[PDB]
Amino acid sequence: KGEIFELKAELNSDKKEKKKEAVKKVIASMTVGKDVSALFPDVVNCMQTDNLELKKLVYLYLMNYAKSQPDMAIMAVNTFVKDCEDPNPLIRALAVRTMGCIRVDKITEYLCEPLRKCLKDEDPYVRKTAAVCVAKLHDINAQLVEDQGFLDTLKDLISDSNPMVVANAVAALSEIAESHPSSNLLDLNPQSINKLLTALNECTEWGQIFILDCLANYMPKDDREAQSICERVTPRLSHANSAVVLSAVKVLMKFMEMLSKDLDYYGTLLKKLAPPLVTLLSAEPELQYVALRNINLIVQKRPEILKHEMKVFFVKYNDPIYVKLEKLDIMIRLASQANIAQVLAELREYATEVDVDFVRKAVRAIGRCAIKVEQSAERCVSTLLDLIQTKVNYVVQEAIVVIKDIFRKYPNKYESVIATLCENLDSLDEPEARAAMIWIVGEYAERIDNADELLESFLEGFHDKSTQVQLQLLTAFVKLFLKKPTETQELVQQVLSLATQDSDNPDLRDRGYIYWRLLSTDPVAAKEVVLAEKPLISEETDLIEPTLLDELICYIGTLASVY
């Protein structure tokens, strides 16, 4: 019933009662769905009232509705400008936070003086908010001279008569270091550093973390400052959780530059970290997932902290599907000559579940672990036995996948039970599963008197299969022939044929081509190329770039750390 302009009408009445109530109906039906950008004029007009809730309220509306209407947005301008020149500290600040919450290209020039005289304030709260809107603006459309002039203020803000001011100043200045005026990092000098500590100790929950998620970008000139500071950081069995504790270690773990084997402060440190870490194994569910991967990081650079702490890393039957596997992961990252015993007991009950990716990754570890040590590989043999014997297709498949890598670490050793892994090759409908069996059948065709039919049984159609399975089928048959020419001259032809004449896949056509560029000369240099030695892997279990490892820790608190 056109019930839109009806409200609009009263939204602009004479007195302030009917109007005020209207303002309530505004934001009310504003956040419920209906877009009331058509009321923008009559709303910002009431903004300049003397009410209280309504005051900040219209302000709320303005931030959210200014975007679509920059033109009429100019309505507020002077309001906020003088609003920051109000009495009670509460307003000036709120006035600013609301002010900068708008990005209208021109609001900039009008905030020139505001924020300027805003920084200057006997009350910290105002300064606090100020610094925020400063960085808040520099994030775009902000360069200028009086713009880089406020920068000078946020920097010196370091030594402020309060913790809040310095807290935000820290977080602010840090966020300003995002934009690159080349002079990134800024200054960081002994004076500013130590002075920050005083404003760091008695700052605030999040406030302190700000200086933590920031000071991370700095390395002491020597061990003096390093130890002196790191020491004042150790007491991080903190409250704020995550942010604080994390950042602490985070920034600290990185400070591993002090004279390597000093009087083990470096060690007592690596130790004084583990305890608070295992505690995150009880914080909010999502948090664990954070720490988890984080663990796979720090521990990868320095594992002598989560040494035998493997215990607590045991997944609870109820734990979320992600934290579950994730925990197992790291658990397979520090599995050594000792823990092996229980690591299996762990997995033994982890693969008996029904959680898809759980059981899958589970066994995926059963393999990798056997590769980690000897004692494992042995019992591991039995594990994979009964396991495939569960007759269940998928598990059987994933299991064979691990079997692949197993021989990669122990070739010419456990090939005595292969005849059994073939009994369930009929349940391999996945690229990796199929590929695996093809590699094993090829890689060790010298003993596989069945390699002929099988290997080529799958090739009912050259392509129309994962490029990977092709890349493997290729090298598989190449060895199938090299050891049995008297019955493969026809296969070699049609295998190489389609693999070199109509091969869409470049590398398939590359392997095929380069391959032929062998038998096309001397199968004498074939054995010296195709069947040569093949070095193991050794405790690979997801090993990341050693360099990428040193810098990934250079920022753990962030989400981009879990990688």
Binding site: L60, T204, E346, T558
Partner: protein, 383 residues
Amino acid sequence: SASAVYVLDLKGKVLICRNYRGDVDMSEVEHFMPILMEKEEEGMLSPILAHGGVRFMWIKHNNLYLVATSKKNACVSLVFSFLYKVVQVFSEYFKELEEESIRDNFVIIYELLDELMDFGYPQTTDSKILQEYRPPATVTNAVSWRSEGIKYRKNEVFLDVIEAVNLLVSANGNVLRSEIVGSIKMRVFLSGMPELRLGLNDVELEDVKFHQCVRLSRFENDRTISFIPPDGEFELMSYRLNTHVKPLIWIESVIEKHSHSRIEYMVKAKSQFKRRSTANNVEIHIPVPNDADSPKFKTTVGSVKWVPENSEIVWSVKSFPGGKEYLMRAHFGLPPISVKFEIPYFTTSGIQVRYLKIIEKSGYQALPWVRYITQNGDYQLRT
């Protein structure tokens, strides 16, 4: 470094929110749910969904999906930590967080948002610390947390040694994870700016996390725990006792399958404590097949029941003395066990409140009450 903050209700539609930075906003938040449901089938229920270079930090509360968003490298850690702390703030202003809860508090909520954080960076906040929404001062000052110069009818404090039993007994009855976590919920009804010291043991414990008001740069350097106590409900500290953790309540069980018309069960129930202690209101969880043919339940001590579909049996008794053994059986026809309880004992981790100092400017009375109890937490056994 957050940039977006959203509040959602089951359906996943924008319940309420405020954008603190510069992100597309409008979209993404809408495609959130669609990606959620799907990212569950894959099993990869990642706490952070991805869509067009937009991260999703979410926390699940009663009938509500709270979410955060930001393309900029966000310190996820603080994210969820804050999101939860936010719940703390609101979960105290109005009974509980619910679609209906927000349904009314719309107005104020916005207000709290503006004072919850700014441009992503969370401006310090907490339920009581937000009551004044004095506000210009109380906060602007260093001592914002919970101190100004008050006084109440009666001045008394209460120390509560809450401890949870961390049990994990593998298939063949062996504990790989033996411990008893816990905290100390401090009830405060004092006046002015009271400073209270406190000790314990230093058997004692392993790691320890305290509460905000603790002078960390004074504890780790003196083992002492001097702090400026925030009036209200706050946890002084969390701890961990995985060492010298003596075994706890026992229980023996065995299956029994005969044909497809009779599956039995023999579960006992022993317990380890101190001569005088008496366990109470205990309940054990023993599930039946994923279905249920003919229900049969026998009792020997107390009472027992079970629940269909949910697939499980719940056996609960009045109490249990300090050193007993109770059995129970049941049949049937055609997920380990995790008990739960409550015991008002002390040596749940060999904990004992050394003392409570009492120093302040005004007169000191000191009426320190202390409690000793401990419930379940994590128990499991059914090979």
